[model samples]
Target: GMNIFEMLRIDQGLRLKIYKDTEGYYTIGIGHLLTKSPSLNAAKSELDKAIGRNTNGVITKDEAEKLFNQDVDAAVRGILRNAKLKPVYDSLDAVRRAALINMVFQMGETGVAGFTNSLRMLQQKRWDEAAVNLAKSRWYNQTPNRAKRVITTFRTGTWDAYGSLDYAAGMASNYFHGYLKLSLPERKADGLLHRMNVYEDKYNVTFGIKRLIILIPDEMFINGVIQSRILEKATPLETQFINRAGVNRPFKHAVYRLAEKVNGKTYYFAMEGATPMLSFFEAMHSNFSATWQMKELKREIWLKFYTHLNELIKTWPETRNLVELIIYNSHDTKGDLVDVGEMLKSHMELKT
Candidate 1:
């Protein structure tokens, strides 16, 4: 059955070089008519780019084969959807089924519809007679071998694996994007302004900066039951805070504002960079248990920094990979920031 698809492609004669057919319109890649393709404009522009000084452009064999499969499959599906032949079409073996679709593909839907006698023969289950009738058509007369293969499949009820539809089943694979969900408790900032500068530079130079933050709500993200605990009334103080930052332009923080109305608690996420604006703890304490000790806090700091950094990077491509393995402030457990030693360690890791 699958092999038959390959035979169909061979019948079409794969061609990447764009050329005119009998009626003279631009066509390429296994009968892909420029007038009919949904992506004609895009393809034409790309064709123009590739053609450059030449009148013709070439596509890879792989590209040609893919276009053929898409065209053929769409043709098959279109036939299956016709008011005249849904269940009737589904009852046949895969070989005959595919053959009929190929027929419709070679000849347009109207042409196939005109084959009333042959179609009736098929509907009546006169397999051999139907095959003979189809073979007598002008389609068969113009393409004898292709007709023979279809006829043979109709009469024999066996699939010839010239090409497989199995590849189509695999098309859903290779997806690259996904979401990373996190339930963050709180966030802090020390080198927040410096981090902002780094990100702004990357966005301006790399991504050209595509952003404009506005009112944006808070309680919109809250779930039920926790609704009361989560602030549902007003916007966070951060909105006013950012407003007060005296940014004459537009507010650039990709941060979200949150308020705990029930408990009077509040949290702010600088999203692109860890922020300590909300919680102003002077510095780390000597004891590990005091005020999130430097070492224990490093990991939390790293997570907050990277989570926001990654979100920011989405706006620009060049900013990506700017800081892999999010580094601590380059300091030890007692220091307020990661010192020179930790910085060297991070550098070594990057080189390795």
Candidate 2:
């Protein structure tokens, strides 16, 4: 059987533009796969370096396209090799096979393996039904908005995989906000503390300044009101890396205003990148089935308009580009009631 990579020649494109952006994501996309099993600190450091390279550094669409190729190839190899999965095609019908295969390729070996619902369907010989259920999984909800295409592929078998689902750029987009999950290496922290607690526990056991947020997220909360977009992009956890170095003035403003914004308004606009707003939106509509009537996401335009704003919110020294690139790829997700809202009228607020 063809190893797929060889047949796809993904590496050819990979080798060509690997030198293009060559910063954070372009860097991390390569490093994540190359290290294969890097220590927590090592992973963080490499990711940080990638971020530094991209901060405020603009790339042409051509550069982005080139970087996407290398990123996808690297991410694919990482997912395939690290994630233990063997494609099960016997049960899948044409549409199902097309959707699953495309999804698997983009997600890596684990992406498919990770589809619990899809796997259950395969186990039961309910291929069509399984494809429907697969559409509901978190894995599907993440990066590319391909629920319709995948479902169409499953139902019709007409070969309808969309948005680089079988390609590199799509794969990289999948990994960051979707595939590459961060968790505490140790079981110290619970849910939100995942990325932070894990790194400190595994890498810096002391819990000292070394373990502090290298770069803290700049949040502008006033009087207990945590407006969503206040902090911009860096996740609160990612800030550890930034804080480790030092932050700019705007970042300082966010941290300083943390106490002011909660009660006044509970905005969930993490338009700044770190907050996962895009990923959050897509997940809600598909996963929780959130619609325009929900509350926050009443208009697609509200979410769509936020894309560049988040990318523009300055990043920490090292991880700037990481957030920027992420927003670039996945910001389209915020068009639903996944969360956030201001009750204006009735159907006028319809969006999803």
Candidate 3:
């Protein structure tokens, strides 16, 4: 019997380009899903050191293939571990096992194993009935030819008579095409972090050295506000603000406002939470499903943006008293919000 690895090799083909999979993840090298994976962070750091900055390029085919084996092998192992499939898997011949693994590689363990009736038929050693059952699937409806090939493999226990098909036949030149013949992006962070910088750049004005209050977003609010042309791109406990007269208002996402004074250092009280305008728009828009590491990366990035603005405000003498920022979703009116530096300028004129 042909090994499952070889079977998978022919089925998924060795794609090396970073294309969006059916599920829209950054996939390369025979279906290595890169979106939100820790590999994204690990790869980015190495590339940054090599290139001297965040930019774009392709990775070695060797790396893509390495990740491909890791990803798909794990998926196969995990699929076999499923309670419904475990005994059935243990009972099958290597050829049938290969076929079962191919199904998992295509539709994922859950998707392939989700065919309860088909799974039962396969468990019962009813190969013909199992093939017929698989034919009656949405998977069959979506790709009849591919489905037929798999069903043939199940029913006859042989590779498709036509042998291997060129899965990479009509894809981009630089795409993860297959095996040693594909490419992957080296600098993915450029596009990933671009939108964040754009939003931060909107505030170019500098406040005097005044400790001003600023509102920073948590995971929930951050994710909700930042939308991209790609990537489904935050969170916190109950947090809200009170108005000038102490009226409670609704809060959108979790916010952290700078305290006017921390450990006796002076801080400015911001009139409203940070990026009030952004909140006005897509408040509560994101249904974030980002990985934990990805969440941390976002936290670090946003903190840098907030801190850059915070440090800049303290550069001027009049605004030098600026301590930190705070977020408040006031129930009452937002009031005429002004940068702490702006408020200090007017008062300075009177003293002068």
Candidate 4:
């Protein structure tokens, strides 16, 4: 029994407040669709009855977990009952089986069944063809990050796709801190370190002693930043730390540079280090996967991004300095740097 319950929770995200999904359907908890309920009050009542508690118009984490469990059980049953999927589902290993359960959970049994060609490929053990078929679907276009992770899981029969999600959730909630190596190159002319005080004054964040610290918030790393460029230049210390940290993946050595456009301004935070920041972004990238270079990011997405960054800053004391220094050296003008005060103010407004 693979723990599909927890996987779906991370994949779907936990939210106490009842809100409409991208499809305009009222959803609560871990993607629990309130189909029978017509309004928020009705949804609240349905949840309260299901959990045998007073939800007070919002569900608690425990209540959410309960709802999530019920939903997952239904999804599992749905897959098991699916005529086309049952034989293939039975033939799959734990990892691949979990992927099916995840797909069924997100999109109903009918939705999963719609992928006729992919299911046929899965049945024949043609993993590559199966993944390719899934990738070409409308579902892939709608939720590329989730679809990509599922496709990768289906293709590779491994949990590496979800590792970043696990890391991001842990970092955002302060459950765990990922390892990183903060490398600041020495001046070419003199052996002295480059001037960093300018960055400190500009970013309003403190710097730390050069040490390992730990974002797409993974595509930004995979596509926008990181890649062979930085990995080829990685120092021996960086490689040693990554290996010792037990990151067994191709993108293990990648670092992230945040160039997010928010409130009509593009703010850059270059995280110059060798760490699992790539995992953070890979996991969080799903939040805003549909849009790139949008005018304003949703409040929840911004909070999650900043919360993880703050956690990294707290864990690696020198992270702020490294990030600011990279941003300072890479970007030309002061306008490119983030205004921490104004950013915080906007975050507060979002809360209200």
Candidate 5:
């Protein structure tokens, strides 16, 4: 069965190199905060043991995963041991319980304990009200995407709330450039009519595939027009091509795959590229101050679409393998090309 730890990997993302978080604390490996563990030396020793290597500024995937598991265990224990949360936590189902763990993972148990009204609502099984209470807080405004996912999962008792377009954070990095290939059923023309008209009359053949390739710039606004175009122009063969375009980029490159089952059919989606931080005062919908901002917005919007796809992937067995993402350093991206199609099979093969 899936757990909150697995979900956190997607939400938090994995980083091999140590970096400073928005709060200016030393962080690494799936949002592990070094400052929280007393001293840098203490954290280094712990990480070194888990990684089986001498202390350096970087870590391996295995080490990050190990540390993440340890962190999750500690978070779980903290939640269960808390007198205030234990009884209420015990009353929830696995899905809702995971939601609580996720919140605790982001903010410590004490931080979650501050949600008095929300926790009370949960104790009473007032799910929607609990979510509403959560939405009214400063936490929601700080990281709306993460907060919304947790709130929705608590309210719905399902994983469907994650990776949604509405909750997508609009942030993009200049280092990422790519194109997305989408396949979808044509709405204006009937399948039979198109098949007969194109193949039978002209080429003397039968069927085919329909797809659209959307060029992703280093920066662009991901709005309704682009989303609508994807839905309207997509075909049956979906894929993506992502390139790391800059030399001095600060982050790593990686690809994540997700499989979701919808109405008995499995759909595949991919997430790659970089999402950088934006100014706190920047408006998500305001008129663009520069062309790059528009491009960045576009990238972020597409990220939401990928999030939608990733959510779909979670319901299938392949999700387990897809969840363990392999992050590549900036140096590795110099001449390398990432092809989503080669890494993952098409949805048709995974038909259930």
Candidate 6:
């Protein structure tokens, strides 16, 4: 079931060469690369290669070493060039392309190639079908933490930095290029981020996949949530993507402009591409209960993921690690999310 290491040795020898050439080298002691140092950050970012090629985070040391040999950025771009995804390649959304690139980087070309139907639909500009293609699979279920971001970028071309915005840090991810800035990262500082994920992956007690998802539209990461994880323990896919960060799941938000207004709560929503209606948790729940007596009420679901955020600012990495672990434990995002009813329940408990 989990054979990423073996997958690379047998079929991804070239991938290794590509990694070294594009991203740089792999440091044994260091978990990820230093974005500042092409070589180190290369290793850190390239770990996503493991995700791209295999089932779970399980892979071989030999394969890992071999993969350390290429230039990852080039490898990613090369993938996009060869993939020939949709919209006739005339105008690929930066967000969507980045998501797939990360997926390819983590899952590898073959891992990404696994979704033949989805890929075909994307190539055809069949936006709806392509979005659907992201559903019901290990990628979607196995790595919700990463999947939600990838899916969001794929469908809507927007993303948040760490799953929830840290009130203090207040950062979301985005990609923008303009007159003042030819190309700006979604998050304020990305190279540093890759370094941190590398630290978390190598030294921390995180488990499951070692892959990290980068937000496409990096700015929204400002005051947003969606993070990268380094594993110490493995978890059920449900608690991870399906429940915590699952696209359709909804969670309660603590930040309110006006506490007095009962409607200040943010309703969870997901969308591929549309101005999704963000409702109050109270409102969405009321629509669902008493279905027989209550009509099945949907305010036109978009391709948006319900967000349940936990601020990690000032918390120990251990604290961050624990909250993420529980998020990965829930049975289902839709159920865990909707089951909360009119009341609010966050998968992660606040530090206060």
List per-prediction Cα lDDT, in the order shown. Answer: 0.45, 0.35, 0.47, 0.53, 0.52, 0.34
Write model 2 residue lDDT over 122-235, tens digit each, in one string: 656665787678667775454324445555556655553332443223433333323112221111233223443454455442111112121111111122233332232322
Per-residue lDDT of candidate 6, residues 5-116 (tens digit): 2222221222222122222333221122323455533544545454365323234445545444343455555665764443323356655565665667567676877787
For all predicted structures, in order, the TM-scores are 0.39, 0.31, 0.40, 0.46, 0.47, 0.31
Greater TM-score among 1 and 3 belongs to 3
Q: Candidate 6, after superposition: displacement of residue 17 in Å? A: 24
Candidate 2 at residue 324, lDDT? 23
Highest lDDT scorer: 4
Q: lDDT-based ranking, best first? A: 4, 5, 3, 1, 2, 6
Off by over 4 Å in 6: 1-72, 80-91, 159-352
Better of 5 and 6 by TM-score: 5
Candidates ranked by TM-score: 5, 4, 3, 1, 6, 2
RMSD of each: 22.5, 15.2, 20.6, 16.8, 20.8, 18.1
Off by over 4 Å in 1: 1-5, 35-56, 159-352
By the TM-score metric, which is better: model 4 or model 5? 5
- Distance from true position, residue 326, model 4, in Å? 22
Which segments of candidate 5 are over 4 A away from where they belong? Answer: 1-3, 22-25, 35-46, 163-352
lDDT of 5: 0.52
Q: 2 or 4, which is superior by TM-score? A: 4
